[PDB]
């Protein structure tokens, strides 16, 4: 597995439901690659951002971003993944509790094997 997610740091927690999500992603890359990493943030449903990283840097690297919150117009009233060349290889889920509180101490990391 050439790229591995080293960690995710939620940077504004807790925050307003209307505030944007500020994340810091740390990843490692063992050797150079030809295609792009695509990072998606998703509210499970609306996509809040899709960041693109290519050429992939070798070694340990970090990036921050600010993704915009979801729209309550689409949400019923009562109610992060990465891919290489379109092949999702890691996915992290969080629980979220208007003040939002992201339960950032219990991430749920799911890894898939792909061909790079």
């Amino acid at each position: 597995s050439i790229v591995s997610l080293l960690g995710i740091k939620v940077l504004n927690n807790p925050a307003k439901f209307t505030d944007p999500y500020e994340f810091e992603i740390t990843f490692e890359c063992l050797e150079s690659l030809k295609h792009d990493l695509e990072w998606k943030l998703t509210y499970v449903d609306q996509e809040l951002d899709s960041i693109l990283v290519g050429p992939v840097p070798v070694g340990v690297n970090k990036f921050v971003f600010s993704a915009d919150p979801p729209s309550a117009e689409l949400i019923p009233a009562s109610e992060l993944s990465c891919s290489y060349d379109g092949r999702e290889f890691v996915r992290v889920g969080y629980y979220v509790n208007i003040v939002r509180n992201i339960l950032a101490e219990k991430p749920r990391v799911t890894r898939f094997n792909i061909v790079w």
Partner: antibody, heavy 123, light 108 residues
């Protein structure tokens, strides 16, 4: 979102000048700030960038040593301190912004620009 | 240092034509490539980001595509407001570099 440059003007070769870019509508801690310049009748040339979250700075070779880019996150403002100026630095200097910050030399597209501020270096 | 060789430097077209502007990168820049429009006395405006994504609020007649180190900006139906400079840009590596520009002038 808005970017407002100020500090342009006229100086002599070897003189100093400091541009400033006041940002509003976004936090500069999660966007990269750029300076792009355009000499009279020429194209755009990248000057410098700052990733204020990581404090990392990058310079075009023609200005390295002479220019210093910096940022104040509490004032949401970036600065381009231009020292040892040369006649070929005469240009309109634009402030620009790209979303996200990387810990390495890599940026997303510049989606907002200032209106530009003229800098003339001459005897 | 990666060079963005833009062509043509100047082209002459009518309203309603299709315009293709190309940019060749001297190395692989993946898709960290953007297209900007500039009119005289005004700041550049972003048109295409990440080589092929159309920026919010840009008329759909603009489009960009990638094929290796060859990047292509296409205007499907030239409008009166569209005559300006277009610059390509790579931001995959230090330094950020621009193409030399394409002035689209009206034919008469």
């Amino acid at each position: 979102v808005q970017l407002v440059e100020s500090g342009g003007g006229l100086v002599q070769p070897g003189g100093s000048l400091r541009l400033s870019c006041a940002a509003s509508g976004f936090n500069i801690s999660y966007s990269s700030i750029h300076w792009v310049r355009q000499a009279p009748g020429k194209g755009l040339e990248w000057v410098a960038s700052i990733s204020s979250y990581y404090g990392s700075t990058y310079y075009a070779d023609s200005v390295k040593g002479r220019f210093t880019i910096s940022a104040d996150t509490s004032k949401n403002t970036a600065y381009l301190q231009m020292n040892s100026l040369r006649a070929e630095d005469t240009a309109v200097y634009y402030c620009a912004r790209s979303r996200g910050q990387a810990s390495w030399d890599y940026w997303w597209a510049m989606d907002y620009w200032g209106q530009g501020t003229l800098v003339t270096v001459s005897s | 240092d990666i060079q963005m060789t833009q062509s043509p430097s100047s082209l002459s077209a009518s309203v309603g034509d299709r315009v293709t502007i190309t940019c060749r990168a001297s190395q692989s820049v993946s898709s960290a490539v953007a297209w900007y429009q500039q009119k005289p006395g005004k700041a550049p405006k972003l048109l295409i980001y990440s080589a092929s994504s159309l920026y919010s609020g840009v008329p759909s007649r603009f489009s960009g595509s990638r094929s290796g180190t060859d990047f292509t900006l296409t205007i499907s139906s030239l409008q009166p407001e569209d005559f300006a400079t277009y610059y390509c840009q790579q931001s995959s590596d230090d330094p950020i570099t621009f193409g030399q520009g394409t002035k689209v002038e009206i034919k008469r």
